């Protein structure tokens, strides 16, 4: 029932500056407590977060723990800045545990200045993601992974910053007509293979598609610039801020800067050779991009 938060955060921050790949061995109960305690905070806040600027918005991390540390040094460690992550914290290179544990720890320590949305990598199956499940059983046991899905099943799904910036991991949904449909989604829940919650975590934009198209991922859909424009006008929004796709400069605009894609994992896999970005929003809702170039 009790967990030394600063002891955990210290050992997690102690690997800063090391050559990425270096681990942090927390006790099994420490990780489980991080999951359980943060889960209570997720359930005690809305599933559609309503946040106010200033805050720094980040895209996928994909377990690249050493790039997350670099993000916090550039942007400022919590609580020096407010953070909203858009999902995909886990993935493979046997450092997903440190990535998710540090984010969950900061979520517990600063629950109203640090925020995490759900990405498609925070699913409750190994239908499409295996690395994080693989890492949990290799370092601990499969039950530890089950406890993580309990935490994941209670993550919020989307966020609206100052009634003007809509944020989610994937993108728009053809079933999304009102914000009420997002707020009515009840937790815990898994990610379905169809429907609003699935598309909010999986869909992509496409220059080619005229409206709604099929997704080359095999799940959800693709929407075009017109979809974006109708969505922002119907809900009196200015911008959709999304992640989910690797982009060259860590950021990429779409539909005349009405959508932006964020990606905070430099050199994903090491074959694309992309940069990481981070979008900073200030009190007057003005957006600036800080870029994390691949260390190697």
């Amino acid at each position: 029932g009790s967990l030394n938060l600063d002891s955990i955060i210290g050992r997690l921050l102690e690997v800063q500056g090391s050559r990425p790949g270096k681990n942090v061995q927390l006790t099994e109960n420490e990780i489980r407590g991080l999951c359980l305690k943060s889960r209570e905070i997720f359930l005690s806040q809305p599933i559609l977060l309503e946040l106010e600027a200033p805050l720094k918005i980040c895209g996928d991390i994909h377990g690249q723990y050493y790039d997350l540390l670099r993000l916090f040094e550039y942007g400022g460690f919590p609580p020096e800045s407010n953070y909203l992550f858009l999902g995909d914290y886990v993935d493979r290179g046997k450092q997903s545990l440190e990535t998710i544990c540090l984010l969950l720890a900061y979520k517990i320590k600063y629950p109203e200045n640090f925020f995490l949305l759900r990405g498609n990598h925070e699913c409750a199956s190994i239908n499409r993601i295996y690395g994080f499940y693989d890492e949990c059983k290799r370092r601990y046991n499969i039950k530890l992974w089950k406890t993580f899905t309990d935490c994941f099943n209670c993550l919020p799904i989307a966020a609206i910053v100052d009634e003007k910036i809509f944020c989610c991991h994937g993108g728009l949904s053809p079933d999304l007509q009102s914000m009420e449909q997002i707020r009515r989604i009840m937790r815990p829940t898994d990610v379905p293979d169809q429907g609003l919650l699935c598309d909010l975590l999986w869909s992509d934009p496409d220059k080619d598609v005229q409206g709604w198209g099929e997704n080359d991922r095999g799940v959800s859909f693709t929407f075009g610039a017109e979809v974006v424009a109708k969505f922002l006008h119907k809900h009196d929004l200015d911008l959709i801020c999304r992640a989910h796709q690797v982009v060259e400069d860590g950021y990429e605009f779409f539909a005349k800067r009405q959508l932006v894609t964020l990606f905070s994992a430099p050199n994903y896999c090491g074959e694309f050779d992309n940069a990481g970005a981070m979008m900073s929003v200030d009190e007057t809702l003005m957006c600036s991009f800080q870029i994390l170039k691949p260390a190697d």
Partner: peptide, 24 residues
């Protein structure tokens, strides 16, 4: 008044700059 999303002068519109984009 309201509150509008603006962009700083340094930020580049890389939409039509042929930036690479992949699905994980």
């Amino acid at each position: 008044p309201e509150k509008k999303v603006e962009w700083t002068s340094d930020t580049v519109d890389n939409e039509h700059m042929g930036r690479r984009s992949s699905k994980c």
